[PDB]
Amino acid sequence: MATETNYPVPYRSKLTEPFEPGQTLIIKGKTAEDSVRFTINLHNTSADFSGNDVPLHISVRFDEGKIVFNTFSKGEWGKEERKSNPYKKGDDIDIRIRAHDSKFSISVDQKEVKEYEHRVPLSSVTHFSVDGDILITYIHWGGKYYPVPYESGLAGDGLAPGKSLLIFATPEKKGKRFHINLLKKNGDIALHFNPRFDEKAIVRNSLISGEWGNEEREGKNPLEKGIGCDLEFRNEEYAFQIYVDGERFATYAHRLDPHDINGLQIGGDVEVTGIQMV
Numbered sequence: 001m002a003t004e005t006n007y008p009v010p011y012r013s014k015l016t017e018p019f020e021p022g023q024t025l026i027i028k029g030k031t032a033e034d035s036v037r038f039t040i041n042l043h044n045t046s047a048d049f050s051g052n053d054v055p056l057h058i059s060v061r062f063d064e065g066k067i068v069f070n071t072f073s074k075g076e077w078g079k080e081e082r083k084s085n086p087y088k089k090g091d092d093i094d095i096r097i098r099a100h101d102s103k104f105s106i107s108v109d110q111k112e113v114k115e116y117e118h119r120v121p122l123s124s125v126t127h128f129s130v131d132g133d134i135l136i137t138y139i140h141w142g143g144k145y146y147p148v149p150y151e152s153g154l155a156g157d158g159l160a161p162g163k164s165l166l167i168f169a170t171p172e173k174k175g176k177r178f179h180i181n182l183l184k185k186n187g188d189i190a191l192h193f194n195p196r197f198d199e200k201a202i203v204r205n206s207l208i209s210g211e212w213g214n215e216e217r218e219g220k221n222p223l224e225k226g227i228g229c230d231l232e233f234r235n236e237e238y239a240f241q242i243y244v245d246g247e248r249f250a251t252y253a254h255r256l257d258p259h260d261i262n263g264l265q266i267g268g269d270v271e272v273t274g275i276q277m278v
């Protein structure tokens with residue numbers, strides 16, 4: 001045991017509403033040199049009956065060196081399904097579970113590793129728990145099926161200074177490029193974020209009164225076809241701080257007065273699984 005703060009195990013959370021197709025559950029944490037295993041469960045129960053059905057049990061085992069999936073229903077477990085555990089005792093873990101109408105899609109380190117077909121109703125999932133040799137650093141459930149091209153207004157204050165736009169996406173395995181535009185009311189694009197795999201660069205520019213600006217590239221593309229990524233756009237005093245998978249990828253000096261950035265567009269060869277203003 002080391003440090004508590006938030007998300008101490010055993011962690012138990014009652015969902016506000018049913019886990020529905022299109023939603024994702026993200027669990028990040030750290031393990032220790034002596035961690036043996038930890039579990040993640042999507043379980044039934046109305047309030048806290050404890051002992052009901054378990055519509056997806058995930059066991060990450062360091063001893064066995066495998067990630068094991070199973071279901072518990074009507075008082076009994078089914079046959080386990082296994083995949084290799086890419087993690088060594090220690091080092092951080094990143095597990096993501098996305099619900100679909102016929103299965104759960106599980107990713108480890110943002111890489112799809114398992115398609116678990118529903119064995120019992122997904123609607124039975126009313127709670128999720130995490131326990132074992134793990135220190136939880138981040139837990140989030142939400143998202144939906146975002147259609148792309150995508151377009152929407154941003155809150156009432158939009159991407160204002162001191163705030164950040166968080167986007168969870170996966171560039172398509174056979175995609176060439178995709179883009180994310182942060183714009184103003186008149187249609188000017190404050191920031192154009194455009195990953196181009198066929199050019200091995202991410203282009204950043206601004207569209208002002210119908211004309212494209214300079215264009216800032218270079219900085220080694222941190223994205224990869226078919227792998228999930230967490231993109232963060234932090235609106236700061238002098239520039240947008242662009243983070244990719246937790247690391248600052250670049251800075252982009254404001255060319256348009258910040259403030260009043262309440263427009264978002266996403267297009268190209270990409271799948272979007274979550275968008276949030278933090």
Ligand SMILES: CC(=O)N[C@@H]1[C@@H](O)[C@H](O[C@@H]2O[C@H](CO)[C@H](O)[C@H](O)[C@H]2O)[C@@H](CO)O[C@H]1O
Nearest residue numbers: 192194203204205206207211212213214215
């Ligand atoms: C469909 C569309 O308008 N796409 C444009 C991109 O073509 C454009 O890329 C730049 O294009 C110019 C020529 O017009 C030149 O080739 C640059 O090297 C290239 O980066 C991009 C940036 O202006 O804006 C998109 O909207």
